[PDB]
Design an enzyme around this catalytic site. Structure first.
Site, PDB file in Angstrom:
ATOM      1  N   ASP A   1       0.815  -1.214   0.000  1.00 39.26           N
ATOM      2  CA  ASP A   1       0.000   0.000   0.000  1.00 39.26           C
ATOM      3  C   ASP A   1       0.861   1.282   0.000  1.00 39.26           C
ATOM      4  O   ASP A   1       1.347   1.729   1.074  1.00 39.26           O
ATOM      5  CB  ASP A   1      -0.847  -0.016   1.247  1.00 39.26           C
ATOM      6  CG  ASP A   1      -1.897   1.099   1.227  1.00 39.26           C
ATOM      7  OD1 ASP A   1      -1.900   1.964   0.295  1.00 39.26           O
ATOM      8  OD2 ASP A   1      -2.714   1.126   2.180  1.00 39.26           O
ATOM      9  N   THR A   2       0.965   1.885  -1.180  1.00 40.04           N
ATOM     10  CA  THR A   2       1.733   3.123  -1.294  1.00 40.04           C
ATOM     11  C   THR A   2       1.060   4.300  -0.623  1.00 40.04           C
ATOM     12  O   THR A   2       1.683   5.331  -0.389  1.00 40.04           O
ATOM     13  CB  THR A   2       1.963   3.474  -2.788  1.00 40.04           C
ATOM     14  OG1 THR A   2       0.689   3.635  -3.437  1.00 40.04           O
ATOM     15  CG2 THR A   2       2.777   2.367  -3.510  1.00 40.04           C
ATOM     16  N   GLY A   3      -0.218   4.148  -0.230  1.00 37.97           N
ATOM     17  CA  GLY A   3      -0.906   5.233   0.464  1.00 37.97           C
ATOM     18  C   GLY A   3      -0.744   5.129   1.971  1.00 37.97           C
ATOM     19  O   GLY A   3      -1.263   5.985   2.717  1.00 37.97           O
TER      20      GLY A   3
END
Ligand SMILES: CC(C)CN(C[C@@H](O)[C@H](Cc1ccccc1)NC(=O)O[C@H]1CCOC1)S(=O)(=O)c1ccc(N)cc1
Lengths: 99, 99
Positions: free
Chosen positions: B25-27
């Site tokens: 998850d890059t967020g």
């Protein structure tokens, strides 16, 4: 481009003629923008996040330019810590995770 | 690997003696795992997003193996609905977003 993850992967988007910053978020199935005016009718959608399921407005076939690339798809509007570009639009950009 | 985003980018991890699946998850600034035991001292923290906020325990310098690569860093633990590998560990893999 190739974006590393030592900082948040924030990009500039254009939606409804307005430039805004948004986060490329591979853990988000959907794209959620902070409250703004969008054209057309909306419908209700329930989405899950870290604190639980929440109802937002769903607008369809909304154009967004992300780093100069034109995508068109479902955009949700509701309370959010930031504008989130999820997998529905990152797949249109051809985005991949690479290691 | 090159991972496309038509589906959620889920990988196998090993942490605290336990094998599980987690979302790349890059967020997510920091890794957060569903409630489990980890060794060592921890500090309380609040993380927030689309659900609102959840209280977590912050453990430092925890080893995790992700797709067979050994990385180390902060791991938050609490009532997240899904295990999430965040940027703080994805950088250690040399993971980038590319389009
Ligand atoms: C909202 C972003 C800014 C932050 N979140 C990461 C997001 O990827 C989050 C991950 C997630 C997936 C599935 C269930 C629950 C959470 N997906 C998310 O909400 O998907 C929604 C938005 C539209 O699509 C659906 S976080 O979970 O709050 C978070 C906050 C801090 C840390 N350290 C770790 C995680």
């Amino acid at each position: 481009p190739q974006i590393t993850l030592w900082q948040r992967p924030i990009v500039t988007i254009k939606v409804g003629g307005q430039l805004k910053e948004a986060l490329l978020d591979t853990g988000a199935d959907d794209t959620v923008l902070e409250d703004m005016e969008l054209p057309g009718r909306w419908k209700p959608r329930m989405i899950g996040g870290i604190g639980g399921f929440v109802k937002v407005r769903q607008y369809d076939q909304i154009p967004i330019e992300i780093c100069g690339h034109k995508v068109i798809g479902t955009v949700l509007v509701g309370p959010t810590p930031t504008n989130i570009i999820g997998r529905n639009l990152m797949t249109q950009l051809g985005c991949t995770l690479n290691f």
